[PDB]
Write a protein that binds this ligand. Sequence first.
Ligand SMILES: CCCCCCCCCCCCCCCCCCCCCCCCCC(=O)N[C@@H](CO[C@H]1O[C@H](CO)[C@H](O)[C@H](O)[C@H]1O)[C@H](O)[C@H](O)CCCCCCCCCCCCCC
Ligand SMILES: *[C@@H]1O[C@H](CO)[C@@H](O[C@@H]2O[C@H](CO)[C@@H](O)[C@H](O)[C@H]2NC(C)=O)[C@H](O)[C@H]1NC(C)=O
Ligand SMILES: *[C@@H]1O[C@H](CO)[C@@H](O)[C@H](O)[C@H]1NC(C)=O
Ligand SMILES: *[C@@H]1O[C@H](CO)[C@@H](O)[C@H](O)[C@H]1NC(C)=O
Lengths: 281, 97, 240, 197
Amino acid sequence: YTFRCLQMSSFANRSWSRTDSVVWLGDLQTHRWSNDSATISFTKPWSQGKLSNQQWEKLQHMFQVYRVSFTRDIQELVKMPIEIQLSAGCEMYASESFLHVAFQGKYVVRFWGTSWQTVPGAPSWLDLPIKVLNADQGTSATVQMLLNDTCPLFVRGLLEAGKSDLEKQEKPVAWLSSVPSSAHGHRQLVCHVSGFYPKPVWVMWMRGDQEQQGTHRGDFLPNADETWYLQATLDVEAGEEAGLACRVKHSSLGGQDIILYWGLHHILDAQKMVWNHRHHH
Amino acid sequence: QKTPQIQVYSRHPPENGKPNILNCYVTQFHPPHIEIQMLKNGKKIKVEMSDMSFSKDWSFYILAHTEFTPTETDTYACRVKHASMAEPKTVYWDRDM
Amino acid sequence: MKVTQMPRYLIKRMGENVLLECGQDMSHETMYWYRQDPGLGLQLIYISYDVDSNSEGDIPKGYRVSRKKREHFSLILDSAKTNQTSVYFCASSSTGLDTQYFGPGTRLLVLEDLKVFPPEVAVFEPSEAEISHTQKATLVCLATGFYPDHVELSWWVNGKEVHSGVCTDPQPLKEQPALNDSRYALSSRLRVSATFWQNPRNHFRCQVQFYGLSENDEWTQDRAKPVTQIVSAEAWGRAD
Amino acid sequence: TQVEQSPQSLVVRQGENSVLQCNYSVTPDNHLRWFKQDTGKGLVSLTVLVDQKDKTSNGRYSATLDKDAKHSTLHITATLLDDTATYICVVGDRGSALGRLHFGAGTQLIVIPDIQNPDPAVYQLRDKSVCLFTDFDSQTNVSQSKDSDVYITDKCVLDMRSMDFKSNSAVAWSNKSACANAFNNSIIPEDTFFPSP
Ligand SMILES: CCCCCCCCCCCCCCCCCCCCCCCCCC(=O)N[C@@H](CO[C@H]1O[C@H](CO)[C@H](O)[C@H](O)[C@H]1O)[C@H](O)[C@H](O)CCCCCCCCCCCCCC
Ligand SMILES: *[C@@H]1O[C@H](CO)[C@@H](O[C@@H]2O[C@H](CO)[C@@H](O)[C@H](O)[C@H]2NC(C)=O)[C@H](O)[C@H]1NC(C)=O
Ligand SMILES: *[C@@H]1O[C@H](CO)[C@@H](O)[C@H](O)[C@H]1NC(C)=O
Ligand SMILES: *[C@@H]1O[C@H](CO)[C@@H](O)[C@H](O)[C@H]1NC(C)=O
């Protein structure tokens, strides 16, 4: 499990700025903090972790002072259109934490040990702003506390409280379709797998015994309801589709895989999704 | 300046006549100033948005979705404005893709 | 070490370039410019984090600044306004939480016109009644009719400056309390032993250093140019 | 104004102790500095307070800080005469140069010398003359003139070093057509010597 706190800060000019942030536990969002909002919003019943009301409000105040401060401080460092991204959290195992900062889409600074360092290949004009920043011994101390202690202690509480929503199972639903391959007299078969949780999945094209080596695993694309979509494609020579199947393995299924053969169930499904092919591609 | 990737895909198997959710997933862009639209027959559609986020390579991503009903004649597309592009990019839904 | 700040006193006419210099040898990165006004407190004009790296304070309007060397920090007023009359303080520190060091200040007066006067000095000789009663003798010095109150007063006895038995008024007095351009008066007192005053060989001198107009300032009045000058008054001791 | 100092002015007898208060609203509140400013001089730092409950010392100066009450005290033990200054309280909202520094208005501390044998008298000194109210005790305040043509300076302590003798004195003068009554706006000691001219 990787726990992330992600901050996004836009500085258009001296008088225009906003910072919205989000928080992930695995592939599930736990927190939202909109620039419109003074308070951090829970996005789950268990987003308070195992902290008490006041214990949470103590931590929230800490962050409230930070956001105002960050905003004013950055605009000063500028003097020595700006996008800044912060990635802070820890990875659970014992644990290991991190604080990475990115400037104009490029990773440039991390908090490491007791102070801010520039990462190799960082632009040298950062040296002054960093020298100024490292002087603030109060910030150094509260950061070390968050990274070394609060984060691990918090996350071990989030996992225990979120046990249920983390272990949940949602079954995949597959369907077939195909398009012209860029190669003459070829077609690309497409196996659509959608609505599964957790993320890990096995999707292959088969000729019964053999896994089709031409099978191309696509990227994981998300669904709005926190489930996943993935498609495996296969480039066949037109006429060779018959005898092929899409096989889907997933933890929600028992041992009972989804096999979809190209050709009755497939016939009715294709008859349900006919169109005029505009504007196809 | 990084150009947005646009990917349009339905939530459930397309069935002409049956209501569905269409997803427009925008990724790999910078700056995070983006305007996203969903179109039925070239016209604006209430379209819900997820909180903007970014990934390990520092690239941004956001998910836009709406409720639609697939037909064999009705066209659907995602339109996106970003500083990286002179004209807004349109990517039509292709169920077979 | 200290913080340097020059000049000490300055009189300028409306709409003139004003350069206020400042220095420190501790090789500090952070340097500041403030102005202090009656009851109001210190207001930050400009800060500097290092060379060529400045930032507007709370009240930057009418002020620009320069820092091409770490040791110096110049405050520039491109065209001076009467409301820019104040005492200006420089300051320095490390980039961290270390001590902040301040300079001695610069009294800047900006005027519509210069029609500014030198002081007239007089020495008043010890009362005979005070000599009889207390066996002590008090000389009183009186600087009158000067503007502005940019003066330094010192007692000179036998050609050496004395500090024991001296006390100068902390604030000047307004000769015309109602007027805002009112001239100032300042008194000082030197107290010696009756025998010391009774000695005819003893020379007493009240000296007022007056910081006024530079010789490059414009002046066309019947009266003489109220330049920077010493005005003195003397008295000899008396046997009788 | 986010920093308030209390009281505004403080009169103490030489050798006694004095207590100065500072209260603030500054948030976040990183550090509190105490400064001493003599007339005509720059500010000089006395002490810096950093912790939540902090206590510091600098010879005769000592201070406390309660970040919860957002309140500091400056203690001066056995006050000298050179302690006559304005005392300035400063709160910083950052632990580095990036910080905004909030300056208080300041407390004026006026330290008065103990004069052992008061000998109040008004002398005439020399057609121009001047009146000299001298050797009165430090508890006496010299009032300003209510008259357009009469000028009166404030009290002023001088030290005859070789004698270990200190004295207060004020001066008055006019252009009117009498020292015996020059200082009547003040509270004049019952046994003030008024020698006849
Ligand atoms: C971090 C993991 C913790 C996990 C537990 C929390 C889980 C709950 C979810 C929370 C959701 C909230 C969204 C998360 C946001 C992303 C996390 C980023 C972490 C940043 C933490 C900052 C430390 C906070 C300390 C702070 O407020 N500093 C303040 C105030 O400090 C003042 O007040 C204090 C007392 O209030 C002290 O007295 C201090 O001495 C004084 O100066 C200080 O002003 C700092 O400058 C703040 C900025 C620090 C980040 C700078 C980033 C460096 C990179 C910039 C370089 C780019 C180049 C520039 C052009
Ligand atoms: C938190 O852990 C860090 C290490 O990740 C500690 O910081 C320093 O670690 C560096 C190596 O990066 C050493 O050079 C220092 O000796 C460590 N600092 C000191 C002086 O302790 C840090 O101490 C930890 N902070 C805590 C426990 O609050
Ligand atoms: C700065 O902020 C935004 C740019 O997104 C704009 O609305 C505003 O007019 C800008 N101000 C200027 C002109 O500097
Ligand atoms: C973000 O929030 C802060 C405080 O809530 C506000 O001052 C600022 O204007 C906001 N930014 C924008 C552009 O909405």
